[PDB]
Design a binder for this molecule. Structure first.
Ligand SMILES: *C(=C)C1=C(C)[C@@H](Cc2[nH]c(/C=C3N=C(/C=C4\NC(=O)[C@H](C)[C@H]4CC)C(C)=C\3CCC(=O)O)c(CCC(=O)O)c2C)NC1=O
Ligand SMILES: *CCC1=C(C)C(=O)N[C@H]1Cc1[nH]c(/C=C2\N=C(C[C@H]3NC(=O)C(CC)=C3C)C(C)=C2CCC(=O)O)c(CCC(=O)O)c1C
Ligand SMILES: *[C@@H](C)C1=C(C)C(=O)N[C@H]1Cc1[nH]c(/C=C2\N=C(C[C@H]3NC(=O)C(CC)=C3C)C(C)=C2CCC(=O)O)c(CCC(=O)O)c1C
Ligand SMILES: *[C@@H](C)[C@H]1/C(=C/C2=NC(=C\c3[nH]c(C[C@H]4NC(=O)C(C=C)=C4C)c(C)c3CCC(=O)O)/C(CCC(=O)O)=C2C)NC(=O)[C@@H]1C
Ligand SMILES: *[C@@H](C)[C@H]1/C(=C/C2=NC(=C\c3[nH]c(C[C@H]4NC(=O)C(C=C)=C4C)c(C)c3CCC(=O)O)/C(CCC(=O)O)=C2C)NC(=O)[C@@H]1C
Ligand SMILES: *[C@@H](C)[C@H]1/C(=C/C2=NC(=C\c3[nH]c(C[C@H]4NC(=O)C(C=C)=C4C)c(C)c3CCC(=O)O)/C(CCC(=O)O)=C2C)NC(=O)[C@@H]1C
Ligand SMILES: *[C@@H](C)[C@H]1/C(=C/C2=NC(=C\c3[nH]c(C[C@H]4NC(=O)C(C=C)=C4C)c(C)c3CCC(=O)O)/C(CCC(=O)O)=C2C)NC(=O)[C@@H]1C
Ligand SMILES: *[C@@H](C)[C@H]1/C(=C/C2=NC(=C\c3[nH]c(C[C@H]4NC(=O)C(C=C)=C4C)c(C)c3CCC(=O)O)/C(CCC(=O)O)=C2C)NC(=O)[C@@H]1C
Ligand SMILES: *[C@H](C)[C@H]1/C(=C/C2=NC(=C\c3[nH]c(C[C@H]4NC(=O)C(C=C)=C4C)c(C)c3CCC(=O)O)/C(CCC(=O)O)=C2C)NC(=O)[C@@H]1C
Ligand SMILES: *[C@H](C)[C@H]1/C(=C/C2=NC(=C\c3[nH]c(C[C@H]4NC(=O)C(C=C)=C4C)c(C)c3CCC(=O)O)/C(CCC(=O)O)=C2C)NC(=O)[C@@H]1C
Ligand SMILES: *[C@H](C)[C@H]1/C(=C/C2=NC(=C\c3[nH]c(C[C@H]4NC(=O)C(C=C)=C4C)c(C)c3CCC(=O)O)/C(CCC(=O)O)=C2C)NC(=O)[C@@H]1C
Ligand SMILES: *[C@H](C)[C@H]1/C(=C/C2=NC(=C\c3[nH]c(C[C@H]4NC(=O)C(C=C)=C4C)c(C)c3CCC(=O)O)/C(CCC(=O)O)=C2C)NC(=O)[C@@H]1C
Ligand SMILES: C=CC1=C(C)[C@@H](Cc2[nH]c(/C=C3N=C(/C=C4\NC(=O)[C@H](C)[C@H]4CC)C(C)=C\3CCC(=O)O)c(CCC(=O)O)c2C)NC1=O
Ligand SMILES: C=CC1=C(C)[C@@H](Cc2[nH]c(/C=C3N=C(/C=C4\NC(=O)[C@H](C)[C@H]4CC)C(C)=C\3CCC(=O)O)c(CCC(=O)O)c2C)NC1=O
Lengths: 177, 250, 34, 164, 164, 177, 164, 164
């Protein structure tokens, strides 16, 4: 699996050249906001047990036909499975934010996930509604603008990391839609 | 620049599937081409989930070593990825016979009625659901150390029959049991497998106790149908641990 | 690997089996009473 | 016992390799966070009594029904046990900073405790009401240094993440 | 490939865990070295046309039997492919100077190495004649900073110990 | 397995003691020279493959019976395995040098070596001589005292960590003989 | 079909080795030995309609309970389906001469044959009695040569030891 | 030790069969072709003192770099050591001459051969320098008979093609 640092060398070795001056400018800066990047993902992994119910009760209370008989969250075994895919996706996204590259995201989590859900019959529209709440939660956890949890932080900018994590969640939404 | 219009074959990935006629022929062969990719995500989902019990708390374990010398780790999947070419190189009856054999064994360890349906429809999942259970509940040959000299005879007595289906009806060798493909690989498979063996007998005192009852339970659940058959499993676990699942050749 | 009987070369089981530890707890108890 | 050491040397073992540069590189960074997570220990190890004193009534101010008969905290030695049990959790975290990983919790408080608490009918919500008080009864500049208090909260919510 | 973070993010993927303070302290090590270790990585980039003429001719001058017919270095144009294999490899040391670990050297220069040399009669002892001389031309006061020299030698003799 | 930090807590969990600053002065005295530990781990892997080549030729030159039919290190297979396991015990003692204390060497290398080196017929006097080579070679690298090579390190007092690794080959010689 | 050469190439493939001198020596002994066992094949092929007629009713002489109502040979179509099976086994021992081994017998005539005769109520003693009449009526200097007779008879008893 | 008859009594042991017709037909080849390769055994064992002598000086005629210091043949104690190593190689091919197959080579001169020489810096080019010269050195009437030269060379290049 690649990361941001190992993305550079593959494109450096796509055209078989060294690393000069013009490539590590997005790498000497990548380690500058790396100290924010640890402060970034320490916020997401401190709340993912609280986030996944905060995002799977939302997909119930918007479309309540899932818990109807014959719905794809009906029994208590269906619900326990759906609470686990929402912990897997929030586990693999949190890897890609720390890696700084989505190479981990669609080799271990997303490659073939769509036609898996096609064969299972998991509804694709109610799954993006499940995903996007965790997108709208992570951007309200990174920039410390949750309603109910204000954490201690060094003062400064953090919207670039929220911009980065917002680019990973919609890869999950696009891969199955 | 001449105005090259897009090809008619390039346009044929833009049509709607209709039922009546040749359109159903192409609709079929692209669905099951993608149903195959569903199973390869079904099988891989349980493959690394069972593997997730081997690494218990993030630290890696002595069971999941892949090599111990310099070139030992890298040569392993050269054997593995070429063995996968030898698995799908089989005949029809070698394949359909292995389909229905796993459906007889996966059906008798499923706890759910959903899990029963997951093994009947997707045959590559019913395969790796058997294999993953023996990895975590260590009821393989490669994890069983026999505790006596009679057990080392008794385990040797059953895998002479297990190796006897790695050959055809006339005694010529099948493609299944094969230990090498290149110059020096077959010797490298030998120096590989002893590091598995030195580490199979390197477990904790608390984990030899766990697979002692498990291999006894493994033999009398899937292979035994009578009282004497569940007597060799109660008394000598490694003799029951060497009972393979007949879809292999070895 | 296979059994010790066929298709394998060198020895196994460098592990004190349950009989083998019974001899040592016998011997330590015997050297004490000696 | 997970740490930065036992993770890079156990994963390197399965490939059959020596310490690489990257395995050498991480333990350089173990000394960078060293001065903080060491520093939070002697404050917790120095005043452990009053911290677990405020941890147990936080079980009780939310749930005073535990003192009912037929319940978990009915007599004294069912409550005298309880102040020790969260003390064991508040002593496990002192072990959890010094190794610097997910070491002592995952073995000694998290593995199989979902059946220890369930079969003995203990309320598992009563445990997470205790440790989610000390996570935010804590001041940043007064209790310890500002940087070591980032590590201290970072483990309690993991324990909050686990029991819930 | 094997970086400082690809191992420690896959050593928590394997257990199905979220990345905790052992998996996060590992990347603090990728800063307090990567300031120092990136001092030499682009110094290799500028003078890379002179290092291959530093070692690649001292090989052929010392192991001088290779210019007879019946050898691999018999003609003229086959020497250029033996000169290309020096800036094929210390190109990769620059690539592994930047990615923290040794990964792109292992997949692209060690995995599948010895089977090709042993077949096509390419003596790997004449490989290390160039490289262990390149290992001992580093003049760490003049060439670079001190600690980036021992991050340049350490990736260099990783190649001696693995070609061997 | 355990490190230099999973040693202090196991000697406190057996007495249920809080790890206070009474014995945390030695952990503050572990990271104090904590640079020189990994500034010594570099001094083995840098020339690791040529280490056992100095050992097994030192074993052959001291005891030349192993080249005879009946000596253990005789055939191309049986020379390979002795060349294979001369490396392996060097690899694990480099971990014990790294990790701070030898609780991983005694649990994944010595766990049944004493019985497979008597049930196979491996000469225990040359085996303790193979270790005795690679103990004196480490103190020719950790003290920069190789005869054919110098190494550029910051010079200082480091020989307390030289007797550290000398306490570790006296734990593997104290295992199989 | 198991024969002289298919087994040694399958044992060389199963180790990945090239054809050795072992497998090249093992066909030297196929060249001289074919000059005997071939001469039973055409000798039996030219005269098969007289062998299976004599070897057929030598089953209805030893057992004549087969023509009782209920048993295997009751009506004339069932008797013809008995003579044909003698003619089948005479083909598969003709094939074992030209193949050079036990191959075509235990592919098409032995495997599964235990279960068909048991289910269809056919007595396997009537099958070995019609084969052993042919094995003993064998004039070794008249019907063939000496070494063609040691090979023609060596398949008729492998079939007998298979059916019992 | 793989030979002409242990490759068929193990192939019949695998299927759990009695010795069939095919495997005897192999060992007939281990009479006819066996006579030539055991005749050639006396050619080699009678003059083994000089085929190690006419090969060891050819090593120090083509590859003339090994007498230098730092090389493989730095002094006299290692030069005769190298001369000793040629003596082991056709000793096993004399063993392969009498056994019939490639028995005492694949277990003794091939098994782990490349892993040893790569450690102590021994070129496979210098080991096959001895053997490839003496392969097509012999003339077919003087050294042995005609077809024995087909036996000796086809066992000689096997040690070349596998070490290379
Ligand atoms: C049902 C109809 C319904 C819900 C269930 C609920 C879900 C929901 N939540 C948001 C926005 C957030 N959800 C968050 C999750 C949590 N909030 C917390 O503070 C704790 C830590 C955690 C619960 C354990 C967070 C952090 C946000 C962002 C803002 C904030 O500070 O809370 C949405 C989307 C926003 C919207 O539509 O208004 C939804 C649907 N809300 C429901 O309506
Ligand atoms: C415990 C089993 C396990 C888990 C979990 C896992 O993620 N990987 C294995 C063990 C393991 N292996 C490595 C490193 C390597 N593993 C291999 C084997 C792979 N090669 C293959 O062909 C296949 C079949 C698909 C596999 C799995 C190889 C070649 C390496 C690299 C060797 C090298 O020279 O670097 C690791 C992590 C350490 C690392 O260096 O990545 C683990 C846990
Ligand atoms: C497959 C399971 C087999 C059946 C059935 C069988 O009868 N023989 C097996 C296939 C086979 N293997 C060889 C040759 C070798 N096999 C080797 C591997 C074994 N040696 C080991 O140390 C270990 C692990 C402990 C194993 C499995 C090796 C080595 C060889 C020699 C390779 C060579 O080049 O000589 C053969 C050929 C017959 C023979 O036994 O040599 C067959 C049929
Ligand atoms: C946007 C997401 C946030 C925000 C982020 C910032 N964090 C800054 C500094 C910072 N974070 C840490 C802790 C981090 N480093 C570690 O070594 C570990 C544990 C292994 C962690 C979790 C540190 C140490 C620092 C440096 C300051 C300090 O001494 O604590 C930061 C400052 C600038 C920068 O570092 O680039 C920012 C902007 N801050 C915010 O206001 C929002 C909420
Ligand atoms: C009181 C307000 C508490 C509470 C405490 C009780 N715990 C009981 C039993 C118990 N708890 C543990 C876990 C604890 N002990 C440890 O040693 C460690 C760490 C290593 C932990 C986390 C154990 C192991 C046991 C059994 C042994 C023992 O008695 O200590 C308990 C008795 C239940 C019963 O006997 O059925 C009580 C009342 N109960 C509560 O509801 C709150 C949380
Ligand atoms: C190989 C070139 C290594 C290397 C190894 C070192 N070996 C060191 C000492 C040492 N050498 C031998 C064996 C040597 N003495 C002999 O009598 C014979 C032949 C019969 C040989 C091959 C032994 C037994 C020892 C242990 C101590 C001793 O007895 O002298 C050593 C330390 C001294 C020094 O060389 O400065 C080293 C460094 N050197 C290398 O660079 C590659 C990796
Ligand atoms: C004492 C045990 C026996 C006896 C043995 C003799 N057999 C003789 C010759 C013979 N037998 C066969 C068939 C057998 N040999 C093979 O090579 C194969 C297949 C590979 C088979 C089935 C042959 C070919 C021969 C050689 C003569 C010929 O060309 O047919 C024999 C003759 C003398 C000799 O061995 O050279 C003897 C004494 N004979 C007996 O009377 C007792 C009972
Ligand atoms: C010159 C013709 C050669 C060469 C030979 C050297 N070999 C040296 C050591 C050595 N060689 C072997 C392998 C040997 N043992 C066997 O059982 C067989 C055959 C089955 C062979 C060929 C071993 C195990 C050893 C180590 C022990 C020993 O000294 O015998 C050697 C000395 C190296 C040293 O100084 O340590 C030499 C010079 N070297 C060459 O360059 C060409 C290939
Ligand atoms: C050139 C830079 C490439 C390359 C091109 C070749 N394409 C050949 C046939 C072909 N090309 C396309 C591409 C184009 N046509 C479309 O309609 C669309 C969009 C839907 C695209 C992008 C298609 C679809 C086809 C197949 C249809 C057809 O032309 O019959 C072609 C001919 C090969 C031949 O002679 O058999 C070539 C050479 N090939 C190259 O190697 C470079 C990289
Ligand atoms: C046991 C039930 C089977 C069996 C399987 C084989 N496994 C082979 C190699 C192998 N497999 C694993 C995966 C193992 N590690 C885990 O962490 C988990 C669960 C999550 C499992 C199942 C490992 C680590 C290895 C060793 C490294 C490697 O892949 O080589 C194997 C040999 C194939 C090969 O050489 O590649 C087999 C046959 N063995 C049995 O006999 C029963 C049927
Ligand atoms: C060499 C310096 C010794 C010596 C070694 C021999 N060892 C032989 C087999 C063997 N060696 C080990 C050690 C090692 N391998 C491992 O996988 C592990 C731990 C995971 C260790 C420590 C083991 C376990 C084995 C048995 C498995 C195997 O066959 O490799 C051996 C050959 C035995 C044979 O093939 O008959 C030798 C010669 N012998 C010596 O004389 C010196 C002292
Ligand atoms: C004659 C010596 C027996 C006897 C035999 C009968 N066999 C009957 C059916 C039958 N036979 C075979 C085996 C044979 N058929 C094959 O196709 C081949 C291989 C190419 C062989 C060796 C089979 C498989 C079957 C069943 C199918 C079929 O009818 O061909 C048979 C008819 C049974 C019935 O009609 O009830 C008879 C009577 N009967 C005798 O009197 C002696 C015992
Ligand atoms: C990942 C790779 C990696 C390393 C290899 C080390 C590299 C390293 N070594 C030392 C520093 C040192 N290293 C040694 C060690 C020695 N000196 C000797 O004379 C002996 C030959 C040898 C072992 C006794 C000593 C004595 C010091 C100075 C002591 C100190 O720094 O406190 C330092 C601190 C000073 C400096 O900035 O250089 C560093 C960063 N750190 C890393 O991150
Ligand atoms: C196992 C087989 C086997 C052998 C073949 C011989 C190999 C052999 N032949 C010769 C020796 C010789 N061999 C030949 C024969 C020839 N010289 C050529 O260059 C022609 C190609 C070829 C003609 C047929 C001649 C003419 C000599 C004597 C000249 C010489 O080589 O010095 C010598 C050196 C002298 C001696 O015998 O001590 C040796 C070792 N020994 C053996 O054990």
């Amino acid at each position: 699996m690649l990361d941001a640092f190992s993305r550079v060398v593959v494109n450096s070795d796509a055209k078989a050249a060294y690393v000069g001056g013009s490539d590590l400018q997005a790498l000497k800066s990548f380690i500058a906001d790396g100290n924010k990047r640890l402060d970034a993902v320490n916020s997401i992994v401190s709340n993912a047990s609280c986030m996944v119910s905060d995002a799977v009760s939302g997909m119930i209370c918007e479309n309540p036909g899932l818990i109807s008989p014959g719905g794809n969250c009906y029994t208590n075994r269906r619900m326990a499975a759906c609470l686990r895919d929402g912990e897997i996706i929030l586990r693999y996204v949190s890897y890609a934010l720390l890696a700084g590259d989505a190479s981990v995201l669609e080799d271990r989590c997303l490659n073939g996930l769509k036609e898996t859900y096609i064969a299972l019959g998991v509804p694709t529209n109610s799954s993006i509604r499940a995903v996007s709440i965790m997108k709208a939660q992570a951007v309200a956890f990174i920039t410390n603008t949750a309603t109910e949890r204000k954490m201690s932080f060094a003062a400064g900018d953090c919207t670039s990391l929220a911009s980065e994590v917002a680019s990973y969640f919609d890869r999950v939404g696009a891969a199955i839609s | 620049v001449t105005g090259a219009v897009s090809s008619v074959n390039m346009r044929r990935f833009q049509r709607v599937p209709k039922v009546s006629g040749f359109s159903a022929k192409v609709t079929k062969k692209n669905v099951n081409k993608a149903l195959d990719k569903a199973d390869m995500f079904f099988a891989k989902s349980v493959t690394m989930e069972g593997k997730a019990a081997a690494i218990p708390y993030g630290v890696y374990g002595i069971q999941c070593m892949e090599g111990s010398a310099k070139g030992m780790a890298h040569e392993k999947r050269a054997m593995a990825l070429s063995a996968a070419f030898r698995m799908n190189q089989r005949s029809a009856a070698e394949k359909t016979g292995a389909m229905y054999e796993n459906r007889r064994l996966a059906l008798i360890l499923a706890q759910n009625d959903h899990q029963e349906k997951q093994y009947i429809k997707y045959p590559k999942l019913a395969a790796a659901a058997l294999m993953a259970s023996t990895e975590v509940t260590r009821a393989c040959q490669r994890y069983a150390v026999p505790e006596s000299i009679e057990e080392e005879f008794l385990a040797a007595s059953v895998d002479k029959v297990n190796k006897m289906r790695g050959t055809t009806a006339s005694g010529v060798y099948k493609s299944s049991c094969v230990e090498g493909n290149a110059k020096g690989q077959a010797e490298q498979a030998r120096v590989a497998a002893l590091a598995v063996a030195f580490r199979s007998a390197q477990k904790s005192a608390s984990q030899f106790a766990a697979e002692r009852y498990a291999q006894s339970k493994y033999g009398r659940d899937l292979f035994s149908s009578t009282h004497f058959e569940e007597g060799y499993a109660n008394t000598y676990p490694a003799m029951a641990a060497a009972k393979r699942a007949s879809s292999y050749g070895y | 690997q296979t059994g010790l009987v066929n298709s394998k070369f060198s020895a196994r089981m460098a592990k004190k089996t349950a009989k083998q530890t019974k001899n040592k707890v016998d011997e330590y108890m015997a050297r004490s009473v000696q | 016992m997970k740490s930065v050491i036992t993770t890079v040397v156990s994963a390197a073992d399965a490939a059959g390799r020596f310490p690489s540069n990257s395995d050498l590189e991480s333990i350089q960074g173990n000394i960078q966070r060293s001065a903080a997570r060491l520093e939070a220990a002697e404050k917790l190890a120095g005043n452990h009594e009053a911290v677990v004193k405020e941890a147990g009534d936080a079980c009780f101010a939310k749930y005073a029904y535990l003192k009912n008969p037929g319940e978990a905290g009915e007599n004294q030695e069912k409550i005298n046990k309880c102040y020790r049990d969260v003390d064991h959790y508040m002593r496990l975290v002192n072990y959890c900073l010094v190794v610097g990983g997910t070491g002592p919790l995952d073995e000694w408080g998290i593995a199989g405790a979902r059946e220890v608490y369930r079969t003995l009918n203990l309320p598992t919500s009563a445990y997470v009401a205790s440790i989610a008080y000390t996570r935010d009864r804590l001041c940043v500049p007064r209790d310890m240094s500002a940087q070591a208090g980032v590590e201290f909260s970072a483990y309690l919510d993991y324990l909050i993440n686990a029991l819930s």
